[model samples]
Each structure stands twice: as structure tokens, then as C-alpha cells.
Target chain A: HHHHHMQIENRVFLITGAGSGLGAAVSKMAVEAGAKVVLLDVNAEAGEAGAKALGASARFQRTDVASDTDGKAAIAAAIEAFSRIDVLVNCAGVAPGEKVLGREGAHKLETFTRTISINLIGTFNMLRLAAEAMAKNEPGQGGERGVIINTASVAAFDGQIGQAAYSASKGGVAAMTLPVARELARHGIRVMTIAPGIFKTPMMAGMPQEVQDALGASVPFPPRLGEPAEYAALVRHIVENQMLNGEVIRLDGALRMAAK
Target chain B: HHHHHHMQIENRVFLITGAGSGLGAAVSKMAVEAGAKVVLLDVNAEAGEAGAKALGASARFQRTDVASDTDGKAAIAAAIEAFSRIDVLVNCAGVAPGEKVLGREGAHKLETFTRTISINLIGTFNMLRLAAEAMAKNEPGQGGERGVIINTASVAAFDGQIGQAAYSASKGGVAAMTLPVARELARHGIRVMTIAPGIFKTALGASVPFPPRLGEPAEYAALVRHIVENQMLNGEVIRLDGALRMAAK
Candidate 1:
């Protein structure tokens, strides 16, 4: 019943960082929902594999989202393949252990730069390119031509120890949601962000059994890591529900994380 | 009767700002009936004199609130002149002007900054320094002694709209009263608090008149009386706004 109300079944979607993990899952689900999906990724091999799995409805474009040259090219590829883009989902991010001042370990400048460049700059790069493309399209209901959703993390609010770079990048993503939405309101575009907590992704899969149990127990109610499908469901909801703009919703099972 | 029950003002000394009119007048009257001596300060000499005459035990101090150096010295002098010491202070002086960013003769940066800094920031600082010096010498109360101060703020500080930069800056001065007071007066045992009102019917309220249904001055007095008795409320700005969050313009 919820699936029928999605309204994005026959739409065109441009998803970034679609080579693996959550992005890969969204691409597969979106394609299955009758969407013509354009996959943008820095990893050529994973991008090709994802597109192949989704069959003819999916097209893979190897483009670095952090670079203006590569970002514009990816948007152009999506336009050529799908004719018009209706939704843009930014899912590219990297989490590296970083501290404000180096105490125990040497804080790698390269790691910090790579994380911010790929996560923060990369998200903005896609938003600008996609928004420009979306502006040229005909407006739909309530003058909305397209919807852009970015993946932020709970770290933006509750940055744990050794998550300085990761938290700062995500904080930028969260803070920009409101202003960006307000700016794009006239252009018939809506901007929103999803800050997810402990999800059952590959990252959580690497944790030991004891650690996983403790982490799951920490959630307030229905105490467990969220499923990937729950994240996709929220994405679909944001696309159909026009009024949910300029908001960042937390999908963390009511868990308010404590500082370690 | 209402003020006597709430504020334990028996033999307590209280100082109030803008005490010549509006909510300040009501607070002064209530403080007097509760058996406390009120020291009144106002820019309007006529109003201050009238208010002082009505409350026989009260002393009136007239001074320009915008000139902090002058006003600060006057406030301290008034404390010394009348009571020789002060136990409590209520900073209720403020102003609100309406002018958008692009409007002709829009809010001058200097006018806004000076008005807000002088009355709100510098006025509060002056009262705090003088009151702390006096209270530092007094014997500790049941909770470890001395003084409690209350400053006024507006809801505009949080969600200020198109024409509220000046008003918001002034109110924001009061909103940030807690932390520094806690740090400064920790030794002297002086507790500082601020009250951020939403829409009360007062002199400042008359400037932005919406309706009487918005908020009442009597209700504001009730909250002030509550703060006076509740000693744990140190270093916090409690919002007396009836849960009405302002919308962004």
C-alpha cells in the first residue's frame, strides 16, 4: 500500500556514490520501482556491476563527485540517458578516525581532507549541478520541479570521540539543509537531509558479536540497528511528501547517544 | 496579597529598573507590601518622583539609561544613598523599534548597537558589579548568602524577524546573563537570572501592540515572584512565554 503512494515509480533518478552500500541498495530498489536510474560513482568496476544488475533501466557513469568537471559530466550523462531528472540523492560519505589535536596518534591531514572533500564538497557539487538541471524542467504540483535528498549522519549532532572530521562534514550537510531549501524554494525544488544512526550496514557487520549486542541494546525502544529498507522508505516518503522540506529527520529508534 | 505569598520579601531589600511605570511599578508595589524596601530607578524624573512619593519608603534615582558610565554610577550612588546595601535587583529597562533591513532610514548600526549595549549589557553589568560588592560583605543566607538578580529579555532573541535586529540584540544581552554570572559570583554567592518574556502588556509591549489576549503584565509578575523564592534558578534565563514559539520571517 505504501509502495503504491510513492509516486516515483516511473520517475527518473540521479543517485551519487551508487557503486556500493546504501547507494547500491537505493539504486536497485529505485530501478525495481520502474525508475530509470543514472548511477554516478568514482569506482568504475562497482558502478558497472550495479548498472548491470539493474538491467537496461540503469546506466553507470564513472565520475568523481568532488570535481566540478566530473560532477557536471555525470549530470549530463543522466539527462542524456533518462531525458529528465526528477530526484537527486547524495549518499557519498567517508568516516575516518580524526581528533582535534593529535595526542595518541598522528592525525593524517590526507584523511581529513579526503573525508571533507568527498562528503561535504561532493554533496554540494551534486546539489548545484542537479538543481541547475532541475530548474530548467517543468514544474509539478505546488510548483515543485524536483526533490534533492542528502544523507547526513547522527554524528552531526552527537560526534563521538575521534569523529572530528566526520562530524564537521556531516554538520555542514545538516546546517545547509534549511538555507538551501529556502533558496531553492522559488526554483520549485525541495532540499532535505536524513541523519541515520546505527544501521545494519557493512560497517556494523564488521563489529564483534558482543559489541553489536551492546550497540543494539543502547537504542531506546525496539532496541536494534535499523534495516537498509527503512532508509529507502524514508527517501521514497520525502519524494512524495512535498511539505517535508528543509527538515532533517533522525531515524535512530529514539536513541540519544551519550559521549564516550 | 498575591505578591506576599509568592515572594518572601519580609525584611528583604529589592532594587528595580524602570520602576516608575508599567510592570516595574507593579513589581515595586508588590515588593513593598511583601515587607521589602524598594529602590526605584528611571529616566523620567517626574514619574520616578511620583512613584517614590506613593511608596513612602522607596527612593527615586533619575538618570539616562543609554549612557552606561553615567547611569552605572548613578545606580550605585542611589543604592548607597538610600539603603547603604541591596539584596536583590530586577533589570526591566528595554526598547523596541520596528524597521526592516531595506526600509528607508533603516536601523542605523550605531543606534542599534549603542542603545542595546548601554541599557541592556552595560546596565546589567553596572548593577551586577555594585550589587555583588555589597552582597559579598553580607552574611550568607540559608543557601550560602548574598544576592539574586533578575534581568528582562524578549522572545525576539531566538527567532527575530524582519525588523527586530535592535530589539533582539538588547534581549540577547539578558539571555546571556547566566553563565558569566555563575562564574563571576560563585565566590561571592550572588545568583543571577534572566527572564525572556514573549508578549506581555507593558510599556515595551505598547510599541508592538497586538492585543490584550497576547500576554498580561500580572502573569509576568507571578513568574518574577516565583524566581525570587526559587534559589536553585541561579544562572538561567527562564522564558515566561506561554510556549508560543516565534516564526521566522
Candidate 2:
């Protein structure tokens, strides 16, 4: 498993939302960089298929990360399969909408709670368990026990219309990053978050070509939607760079979103 | 008819934490003195109670643990009973400043990190939720403003030093949330802003580099007063450090 691709060789990366999209891109890149991976996704069919396709380097776990039972199971499975876990990339999330008075009178309280449950609390659940496990790790190349990279969004900073629930959820993820990183630092565990802007994924690619181009052109520079690979590249950089902890990097091509 | 004080927020209710002493007490006393009905809540009010008593008619005091749901709800209920509406909420509650990821005690206690987040960030969230819910229902004030919530972050939020890991994170969370929450609540006529004060003379005077001395509580209070009147200043975090960039300890 160790062929020396520098930082990632032999490293075990546990990525949530790994069945598709950004998570899929990262899984592919991590393996290509010589890292072993534990892929967790709520989609059982895709999760099994993706693991089978990744050959010897990837193992899949079907999990509802919001539940303690499922989360612990996935972690246990990762440790058992990979022998250790060195990185945690939290990418599982859902965007739900509710406006105070958009014919619905008030946004559904349950919707807001559900978004927080799946995004904010779910992210925290993984961090707590992973930090505990990583603390036991013997120091690696940089005296580092582990690295945790979480996914926030441009929504966290400038949420558009109907994004109150999504904004709060991602905002919680960004808000909690620093404290988690500071607390985990002594254990040689570094934590960081990446807030991505609009990205070209199946969600957008399925739209008409003209619509896709318009969305891409709205960005400040290069005037295009972000690539999944671009986000993965930063993940690789953060993993290699030892000093970048307790920070939330906006991977948005200098794009500041306007209100919708 | 008796003449009322000619001041902004006169007769409006203000809820402030850490009202027992320090910056919170100064703001509470000033608000009451300015003819606003003030509800002062601190963890355990010895000085705050006496301070409230001194302010008389316009001041109400109660001990509150802002991080607790029970305390937060109860305090909000008290504010309503005393004044019917919460027009302003000032989050002045935070843990004492401390140092590094690794301290003299070996590594920083995990509890230290948790406590900082709970009291500074989560506690701020708790109070704002209650006050904002009330304000959203109030008839819009001048220029359609229903309420304003001011959160106290620290200069560490912008440029922190080696030993400021916990404080920086706590303050950073406050600064980061100000805008998003402001944007979300703007339609309801709620404006949110954060002030990252440099070191002050109160218990924090020695920490300031300028005046080679500490800042006065009255000065900070003045900024709060100005912010209330200046309706356009919303969804921003101001660095009130007077040009002293913090040096790494």
C-alpha cells in the first residue's frame, strides 16, 4: 500500500458522501496519490459498486452519519479494514429550503432541525470520534496524528433566497472548525474547512448547456463553475502542509456571492 | 405630562449579559440612565445587583447562565414580563482570556476549548434566537428596524497570536456569523453587528499596547450607543483596536 507518493502514500482517508460528486473525485485522487480510502455514503448500491471499482485501496461503508450507531460502525469498519485512519474529509450534506412566509407562512421548524442534524451535528459527530481515534496515533512524518477537512459552502457566508436553513447548517460547520482544530492540536490533529462556491456537478451539468454556461459565467474569474478536481487539489495541499490548521479556506475563485 | 429623556432607544428595552461588572455593567447603567428600560442578567450579580439598584426605576437585574437553555429562556421571559419587548440584545459574556494549544499545564484542557465555544459562541446564538423572535414581531422602528443585536468579538478574530487559539476561534465564530444572521433577519428588520474591541482597562487594561494603558468601558459603551442610532451600520464586524496590531506572544 505504500509506494511513496509523498504525503498520501499509505495514508488512510475516510471520506463521507463518497458515492458521487466531490467525494467521488476526492476518492479517485486519494487513491491515485497512493492513499488507502474508506468510503461512506448513504447510498448502499453506489457505495458497494464504487468500492468494488477502486480495487484494493478502497473499502465502502453504508452509513447514516447522523446516527451514533451507524457512525461508530463506519469508524470501526475503517479501523478494522485499513488498520488506521489518518484523515477525515467530511463531505456529506443536504440543502433544504424554508422562507418565513413563502406561501408556507413560516419555514418548517422540522426542516431547519433536520438540516442541522444532518450537516452540523453530523459533522461534529465524526470529528469527535475521529479525533479520539487519531489522538492515539503515533506521530507521523511531521509529528502529526491526523488531519480533518470539512465541507462548508459559499452559502455559509452569503446565503441566497430560501437558504436560511442551509446557511445555518454550513455556518455551524465553519463556526465549529476553529475550536475543534484548537482542541485537537495537542493531539497532533489538525482541522480545517473548505467553503466551495458554485461547482459543476451532476446537479448543474444536467441543466441545459446555456444555463450551465450562464451560471459559470457569473463567477469573478475564469468565469466558470468550480471543478470537483479543483477542490480535491486543495485537499491534497492541506494534507501536505503542516501549518494550515484552524482556518476556513474559501475555495471560490475569489467569488463573492450576491443576494438572491 | 412629565418630560421624557431625549435619547434614542428611550423607553425601549435592552438586555445585556455580564451586567454584574465590566463592560456589560457600564452599558446597562448607561442605557437605564438614557431613559431605556434595561434588563441586566449575569451569572451571579453582586455588583450588578447593587448597580441595578443604583439605577433604580429603569433597571432590572437577574443572574443568568447564558449557555443554558433553561436560563436563556427564563431570562427572555423575564425581559418580556418587565418590558414586553426586547429591542436590543448585547452579548458581552465570554470566558477569560487564555493561551495556547499547549499551555504550562501540558496541553490545553479539552474542557477549556468546549467551555469557550459554549459560553462565547453557542451562548450568543441562544440569546439572539430568543430576542430576535420577539423583535421580529414588534412594529418596525424608524426605517423599518425592529431590533438590533450586537455581539462582542475580540481583535484576535482578525489577527491572533500564538497563545490565542481558543479566544481566536470563539471570536472568529462570532464575526463569521454576524453577516449571515444579519442577512437572514434583515427582512424582519433586525440588524446584527460585531465589535472586536482591543484590550480595555477594566480587567483587560494591561493587554493594550496604546496609551500604553487600557481603554475605558464608557468609550466602548459610546460605540454601542452610536451603533444603535446609526441604522445603516449592519452586518459588519468592526475592529475597534485603534491601530494596535496584536503581537505574537
Candidate 3:
């Protein structure tokens, strides 16, 4: 009922950070929707194991999203396996902490650089490669080539204390959305970013119940944390609804957070 | 009448970009009247030098390109050397270029698009980062606010027109980072904010969402003054467009 013609089924999806959390849930969800998914994660064990569970409809490639060599190889892998790439999802990120100036002194410039490299530049690398692949596909309805879903966070908006580097990285992702969408719009490709609030991914769920509740309580309403499954559902919903492009939607359930 | 508002800025130090003309010029004039030290920056040396000559010693002029990391870095250094302290930073240096993503020439020039981002977005980021670094060393002010950095984005960030893809993206970049940058800088007692002003005549008037006239440059400066004195405003983008939303062309 939720998909409402997202047409995601049987299409190819390349998901980074697919080893666990939102990426894993989305990968599994797409398979249920009858689409082929190419899972790329830095984790060899989880990625390979997750793909095996999906019975060959899914393939996992151990790829460091920040590296051009790895990202390019993954793109090659997706094309070789599916013959066509339909959608790209970027979900790999790290919420590292650093301050402009704290007791530890100003956050290392390298730390800030590394955070952007992985979370922001890494996202760009994947999309540039993915767009090239998607551009090759024949146009579908409305002359649409494909869709790209990028994962940001509420941190991009209401960053917490010690999140200088982390927020800057995510902010870069959110900022690039419109221009990327506009540039690619001509090629029948759409780009969107999702800023999720306190979501309960496998990593969080595995935490102690008290910790989970504390995180959930932070949200203003619905009285709970978000689920990666719910995030997965939204991804499909977006792919189905073409009208929504070049925008960033927050899935935080109305949680306007303060600096924690 | 709020007589206290003007009094709040009596002796503060403000470093502003593009102070030789437009919004920067207005703010510089206003800050000087408010008895504040104004650090004026501009790429055009002719205007930059001339503008400072009018303001006297209360304002110093620096020739710098806000988009050039080297220039911005040097400007920050000069500002520090002169004032020994910078209480505020105003990023008003920007360029407006219009082009469709896929025009008759087949896709907008990649250079044009990147150039806009470099000047408007990256340039803003460049100055903000440098200023934040220096502001962090200061003794915390009232409300623990070490300093304030306000950026000049545009309403285009919200409703960019057909030919405004690049401009809108750069402005949107400014709005998007307000939160996270604010959060990260909170530790240093620094506040980051942005203002998205609408079209200018006493504003670019009559063509607006209302009040049927170009906006007065002083109107924009007034808001900056208010934002500076008001401690509660932070990590947010406020639109001072007189309730006008743009029609996407």
C-alpha cells in the first residue's frame, strides 16, 4: 500500500553501508520488492553473509566507498552482475566527535578532512560513478533514467556539541542535493537526500534496552526511535513518487534536537 | 521606540566582506554609526580603498577575495592583527550567475556551476571557518557567546528559479550547514546564523512578495543588528523578505 507505484521492483539498487543498519534493511527490503540489489560494504563478513541469505538476487562487494579504485570497481561489479543500474543509495557514514576547540585542543585538521572524505566525498564518488552507469540505461517513463537516494541525518540541521566535523560532512551532502539533482535532471536522473533522526538500526537495537529508550525518548512524538526498515520503506516510496526530487526529507518524526 | 537596540553594538568589532558596495557597504555604514569598528573587505581595490577612506579610522579596508582561500586566510590574519579581536563576521561576498542545467548549449558549463559554488558557498565556508578559529580564543562574552558569524544567503535557496540552479544550490548549502556548524561551534561559545534576504530599492521594490518595491539596503542591516544583539537566534536561517516567496521562473 505504501509503495503506490514506486516501480522499484526488478530494478537494480546499489547500497553502500549495506552490511548492517539502514543499508542492510533497504537492501533486504528491495529484494522483497522484487528488485536486484548490489551490496557494497567495507565489512567483508557481514556483506558476504547478508548477500548469501538473499540467495543470489543480491551480491556483496567489499568496497571502501572513499576510494576511487574501490568505488569504480564496485560500479563495474554492479554493471557486470545486473547489466543495468537503476538506483543508487548512499548509507555509509560515521558519527565521529570533534570540537572547534575543546580540552583536547582544536579537532585535528586531518580528523575533519577524514570525516568529509568518508561521509561527503565518499558519497560524491559513488554518485559520479553511479550516474555514469545510470546514464547508460534507456529512459523509462517521463524520460527518467534512474534515482539516487543519499542518507544524511538530523545532525545536518541541529548538530550536537562536539559534532563540528561530523555535521560539516553531512551538511556537505545535504547542500549538494539540489545542484546535483538539477544537473542530472536533464539526464532523467533525480537526486535526493534523507535526513533521518534517531533510527533504531540493528546496531542500536543490539544495545541495552535502557540505552535504546533514552535515544527514543529524545524524539518529540511517536514515542519511539525510527527503524531502518521504516527508512527502507521510505526509499521505495520515494523511488515510486517521481514528483519529489532535489529535496531533503527528514524522517525524524518531528524531533528538532538540541546539542547533546 | 527601542532605544536600547542601537546601544548594544556600541564598541563591537565586525569584519564584513564586499564592504565596498551593496549590502556590505550598508552594514559598514550602519556599524560605524553604531560606534563599532568595521573591517571592510573587497576584491576591487578601487572601491575597497575608497570606501575605507570615507569611514575614517574606525573602519579598516582589506583587499581580499572571499572565495579565494588564500585571500580569505590573509584577510582573517589582517583583521586579527588590526583589531586583536573580532566580535562578528558578515559574509556578503557572492556572485549571481543564471544558467539552465540543460540549456541549448547542452548542459550548463561545468565551470560556471562550480565557479558559483566556489564563490558563494565555499567562499562563505572559507571565512566562517577561519573566523570561528580565531573567535574561539576569546574570553566568553555575555551568554557565553564568544562571537557571532552571520552569512548572507538568499531566498533563492528555498525557491530557486529555472535558471537559478547554481545560485540556489550555493545558498541552500549555506542554510543547510547552519545547524551542524552551530552545534559544533557551541563548545567554543560561538554562534552561527544566516539571513536569506529578498529582492532590493529603498529593495529591488514592487517586484516582491509584498510592499511592492525593492528592499532598502538599510533594512537588511537592521536585521543583522537585531540578530547580533538577540542571543536566542542561532543555527537558523531567517528570511527577511517581507512575506514574499519567489515564483520559480
Which candidate tops DockQ?
Answer: 3
Predicted candidate 1: what Cα RMSD to the true structure? 12.2
Per-candidate Cα lDDT values, in order, are: 0.71, 0.78, 0.82
TM-score of chain A of each: 0.92, 0.95, 0.95
Interface RMSD of each: 13.1, 5.3, 4.2
DockQ-based CAPRI category assigned to the predicted complex of candidate 1? incorrect
- Candidate 2, residue B32: how far the Cα is off, in Å: 1.0
Candidate order by decreasing DockQ? 3, 2, 1
Error at A66, model 3, angstroms: 6.2
Please name the candidate that would achieve the greatest TM-score relative to the true structure: 3
TM-score of each: 0.53, 0.77, 0.79
User: Which 10-residue window in model 2 chain A sums to the lowest lDDT?
Assistant: A100-109
TM-score of chain B of each: 0.85, 0.92, 0.94
**Which ten residues in a row are the worst by lDDT in model 1 chain A?**
A100-109
Write out the backbone clash pairs for model 1: B141-B145
DockQ (C-alpha based) per candidate is 0.02, 0.17, 0.24
